[PDB]
Amino acid sequence: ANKRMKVKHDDHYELIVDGRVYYICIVCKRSYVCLTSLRRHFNIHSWEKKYPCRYCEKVFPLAEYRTKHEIHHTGERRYQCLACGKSFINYQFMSSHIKSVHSQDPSGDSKLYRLHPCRSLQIRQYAYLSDRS
DNA sequence: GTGCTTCCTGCCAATAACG
DNA sequence: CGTTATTGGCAGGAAGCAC
Ligand SMILES: [Zn+2]
Ligand SMILES: [Zn+2]
Ligand SMILES: [Zn+2]
């Protein structure tokens, strides 16, 4: 067991721009609009927590970067098109497909795709993957 | 330039600590 | 369920690598 603490540290600095408070990493002076985003980033400098793969000996500095890489190892077709029903492994291939085949914008107000949960590997499952209508 | 893969980062929900 | 602190999954393209 360890003694819990509820304190901040000098691992960043604040910079006010156009009224907005930004948070900046001390090492590389990268700016962030959210502290949550900054904390995620600082793990790339500290290497306090490693995120090693299962199928190879590779290590990532972020949990989500590992997960997305492992989705490419397993081949989980998360993104399904709704126009032609075709399934894709990530957003980048899906967007390219919808543009080249259907000549439509998935970031528009049509919504021509649906996201299915990942079952090939273990992750937290948001209630919008479970069932939405 | 075309094609494959990983990185960036605000946004949002989930986890943990304390009541 | 209400605050404080961090994890870490999502959208969507830019950047890097291969040709
Ligand atoms: Zn930094
Ligand atoms: Zn791997
Ligand atoms: Zn389609």
> Which nucleotides of chain B have an atom under 7 angstroms from any protein CB?
4-15, 17-18
Q: What number of helices (H) and strands (E) belong to chain A?
A: 4, 8
**Technique used to solve these coordinates:** NMR
Ligand 2 centroid to A65 CA: how many Å? 11
**Which domains occur in chain A, in start order?**
1-48 (3.30.160.60), 49-76 (3.30.160.60), 77-116 (3.30.160.60)
* Strand spans (E) along A18-81: 20-25, 31-32, 51-52, 59-60, 79-81
What are the backbone angles phi and psi of residue A73, rounded to the nearest 5°? -75, -40
For residue A51, the CA-to-ligand 2 centroid distance in Å is 11
CB A88 within 8 A of CB A79: yes
**Angstrom distances, CA of residue A24 to CA of A35, A44, A48, A83:** 9, 14, 19, 43
Q: Write the burial class of residue A80 (CB in 10 Å: 0-12 exposed, 13-18 middle, 19+ buried).
A: middle
